[PDB]
Amino acid sequence: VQLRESGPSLVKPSQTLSLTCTVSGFSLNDKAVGWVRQAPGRALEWLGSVSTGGSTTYNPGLKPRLSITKDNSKSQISLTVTSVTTEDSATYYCTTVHQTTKTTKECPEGYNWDDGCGSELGCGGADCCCWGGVDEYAGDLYSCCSVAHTYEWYVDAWGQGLLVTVSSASTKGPSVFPLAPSSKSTSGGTAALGCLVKDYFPEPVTVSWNSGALTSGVHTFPAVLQSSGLYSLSSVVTVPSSSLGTQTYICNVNHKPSNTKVDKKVEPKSC
Amino acid sequence: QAVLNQPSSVSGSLGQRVSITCSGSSSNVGNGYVSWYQLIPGSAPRTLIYGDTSRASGVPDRFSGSRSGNTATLTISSLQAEDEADYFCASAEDSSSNAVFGSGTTLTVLGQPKAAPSVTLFPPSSEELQANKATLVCLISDFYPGAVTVAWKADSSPVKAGVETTTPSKQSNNKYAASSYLSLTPEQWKSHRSYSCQVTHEGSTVEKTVAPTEC
């Protein structure tokens, strides 16, 4: 099953965060779809889920600000967190939850299984009958079988997640600059080259090379947060020094928060 | 903020066993049916164990889960570098709908081979100088353990400001990489004679230099 999150990467402080999840390859009217998030440096935090029909369920500590609706028509579930703060900046994952409450039949303490219960006890079955000794006053002690409840919960599939940042700062696309290889910056048969993705906001940014056709020796680094409030990162790929002139190398930068994609060809320096 | 109790950090050598505990109470782990999830940096969480002991599809047998009362345990045998991640347990709290997670356990796999950093210092590009900016990029890769210090020098003297350095992060080959930036004005870049990025790691210090006269 595919779980795709959609919504704003950026929400201003003390406003409402609206996220949508589009499920592809399942009906929305049985399988439970839930939301899990993780703030930076914090543990996974359960938010809520919607079950068959619309049995919504939230976290006791966040139900006042949380709201989850459901539209089987468009096969979409939505989440809403009101009056958000920096503590609500996190990756929000759409998930398919498997809720289930297994039931098991038992007798009270001291009672055992027996077939002595009368029909007036309304136990709903001959096997659902318990007996616990012979009381001196009441006589044969009859009682219906008690039903327990075993709670079952786990996450079957995880969406890729959508990173949300709570800030008053406005979105800014990236400026992509070449990190070109040089006659002195080589390492023998291999040469390092890359792209500098500078001054963007909010996170995240992803980078591929040659539209994914080139993956060996690629590493995109985590971003740095500058004093300006803008992020920057680099992506480097190791290539054969002898191919610099003939093979073309293009970094594919994706910054969904600003609906921007940049392809930058990295030319080899004459130096 | 109720969270199940997990050890902050655990360790184990390649090929050996490791155990990660998940202590809670009778309303959670006691009722049974605990689950485990793996979260590798840069990837969505992956479900490993559910129902205390059942493995999810595609999970290797070396991952196994158990439970003894109000404490569950994830055991990982034949450890390998790729197992380094954060591991969270979870369970329902007196309600098949509501769920609580654990504090999370970071696994450190010991005994991995060491490797020295490969440093490449890029001067500001022409494209950036045209925007009246000048950033020096120092990229560091293929080292282990993931611990380095970076120092910037201008004309054999230390840089007093303008530096930003990322924390080492794992590559696809399990070695660590890191990056450092020196933000300058086009004038400073042309004023000085050379700039250096110094990378210290396990007794060696690798220094890479650039100068605008080479450009």
Author numbering:
A (entry chain H): 2 to 82, 82A, 82B, 82C, 83 to 269
B (entry chain L): 1 to 9, 11 to 27, 27A, 27B, 28 to 95, 95A, 95B, 96 to 106, ...
What's the paper's own text on this?
The cow antibody repertoire contains a unique subset (~10%) of antibodies possessing ultralong CDRH3s, which can reach lengths between 50 to 70 amino acids. The unique CDRH3 structure can be separated into two microdomains where the antigen-binding disulfide-bound “knob” sits on top of a long b-ribbon “stalk” and can bind to both surface and receded epitopes. Ultimately, we isolated a total of 8 and 11 cross-clade nAbs from cow-485 and cow-488, respectively, all of which had ultralong CDRH3s, suggesting only ultralong antibodies were responsible for cross-clade neutralization detected in sera. BnAbs from cow-485 were named Bess, while bnAbs from cow-488 were named ElsE and assigned numbers based on their order of discovery.
The ElsE Fabs all have CDRH3s with 54 amino acids and 4 cysteines, with a 1–3, 2–4 connectivity, Bess7 has a 61-amino acid CDRH3 with 8 cysteines (1–6, 2–5, 3–7, 4–8 connectivity), while the 55-amino acid CDRH3 knob region for Bess 4 (6 Cys, 1–3, 2–5, 4–6 connectivity) has no ordered electron density in the crystal structure. Ultralong bovine CDRH3 knob regions fold with 3 short β-strands connected by 2 loops (Loop1, Loop2) of varying lengths that can adopt a multitude of different secondary structures, including loops, helices and β-turns. The Bess7 knob is quite different from the ElsE knobs, with its Loop2 region folding as a long, 14-residue β-hairpin, with residues DEYA forming a slightly distorted type I β-turn at the penultimate tip. This hairpin turn bears some resemblance to the tip of the long β-hairpin CDRH3 found in human HIV-1 bnAb PGT145, where residues NETysG form a type I β-turn at the tip and superposition of Bess7 (using the EY tip residues) onto a trimer-bound PGT145 (using the ETys residues) shows that the stalk region is long enough to allow the body of the Fab to avoid clashes with the trimer. Bess7 is also notable for its interesting disulfide connectivity pattern between the 8 cysteines in its knob, with three (D gene positions 23, 24, 25) and two (D gene positions 39,40) sequential cysteines in the sequence. There is no convincing electron density to indicate tyrosine sulfation modifications in any of the antibody CDRH3 regions; however, BLI experiments indicate that Bess7, with 3 tyrosines in CDRH3, contains one or more sulfated tyrosines. Low sulfate occupancy or flexibility in the CDRH3 knob region may explain the lack of electron density for these groups.
